[model samples]
Target: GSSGSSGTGENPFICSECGKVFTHKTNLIIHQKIHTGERPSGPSSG
Candidate 1:
């Protein structure tokens, strides 16, 4: 996987697939939800 530097003024954990940058790994995890199509915006219609 692509590497990122520590929490500094520059260099953040950026996703190569969507080019979304995050200051923390947790944020990156949340950002990946967009790529996975996992969201809470739908109802239980099934």
Candidate 2:
């Protein structure tokens, strides 16, 4: 019920590549990463 930055919760995030429906936008974003990728050859500056 308390979704920050979700924008009124009227719309649900859906992946156009796939008609997948999930509760959180982050979930969709995470799933989308699965469909695309780039090998991280360099070291992270973290």
Candidate 3:
């Protein structure tokens, strides 16, 4: 299951949390970690 109409459209993968536009779906999925508290707990975690 995925979004419809995939082509040369600007910002297809939009973030539901902050309403941010993303060019890639991977970025959109990773962005949700911030709100879901699933971010990495490493040295750059801060």
Top candidate, metric TM-score: 3
The collision pairs in model 1 are none
**Tens digits of lDDT, candidate 2, 1-46:** 9756654545587888776877899999999987788787688778
Candidates' lDDT values, in order? 0.80, 0.79, 0.78
TM-score of each: 0.50, 0.51, 0.51
lDDT of 1 by residue, 1-46 (tens): 8787565457668888788878899999988877887568678788
The better-scoring model by lDDT among 1 and 3 is 1
Q: Name the Cα RMSD for model 2.
A: 9.4
Candidate 3, residue 7: lDDT = 65
Tens digits of per-residue lDDT for model 3, 1-46 = 9678656755576777888887788988988878897757679755
Candidate 2 colliding pairs, count = 0
Task: Look at candidate 2 and tell me the lDDT of residue 4.
Answer: 68
Ordering by lDDT: 1, 2, 3
The regions of model 2 sitting more than 4 angstroms off are 1-11, 38-46
Error of 3 at 21 (Å): 0.6
Candidate 1 to truth, TM: 0.50
